[PDB]
């Protein structure tokens, strides 16, 4: 997530400033700059497990194709819940199950 400009609405870029040796977000379309307090700029992970939660919506409770179980909910201890697997299409995706309750409609794993 990179910050955007204010008058031309363009994303900014890191740049080094020498008299105060500061990292700043700058725009080339115009002359708008701002201070950058985060050295964290580039992220590239070879193996990730982000996205296993999937796009769960409050309307997932009435899907008839999803299997139904009777697992113990953490907070409301409901006996009605559904379960599925990770949405990620990675080759090495694990088979850990994801459970969603019905009274509170929130997720919980086996951990």
């Amino acid at each position: 997530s990179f910050r955007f400009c204010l008058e031309c609405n363009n994303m900014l870029y890191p740049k080094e400033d020498k008299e105060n040796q500061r990292l700043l977000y700058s725009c080339r379309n115009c002359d708008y700059t701002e201070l950058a307090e985060d050295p964290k700029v580039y992220r590239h992970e070879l193996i990730t497990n982000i996205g296993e939660t999937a796009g769960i919506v409050d309307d997932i409770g009435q899907d008839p194709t999803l299997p139904r179980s009777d697992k113990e909910c953490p907070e409301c201890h409901s006996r009605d819940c559904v379960f599925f697997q990770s949405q990620q299409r990675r080759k090495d995706t694990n088979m850990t199950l994801f459970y969603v309750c019905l009274n509170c409609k929130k997720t919980f794993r086996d951990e």
Binding site: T65, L66, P67, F84
Partner: protein, 56 residues
């Protein structure tokens, strides 16, 4: 249901020919037979061409 990995849900015919086949088992058997027929049909032409090339 979704994410079903039981044998009966992935092409296991637990009944015999004498006892008959359930509709799901019938469809899976038909799929397997169609795959076998296609494999034989595509294999015959390649084998014939290979034999002709060897003979020549």
């Amino acid at each position: 249901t979704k994410d079903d990995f039981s044998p009966e849900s992935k092409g296991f015919v637990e009944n015999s020919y004498l006892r008959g086949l359930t509709p799901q088992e019938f469809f899976f058997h038909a799929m397997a037979g169609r795959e076998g027929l296609i494999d034989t049909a595509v294999k015959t032409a390649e084998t014939g061409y290979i034999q002709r090339r060897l003979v020549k």
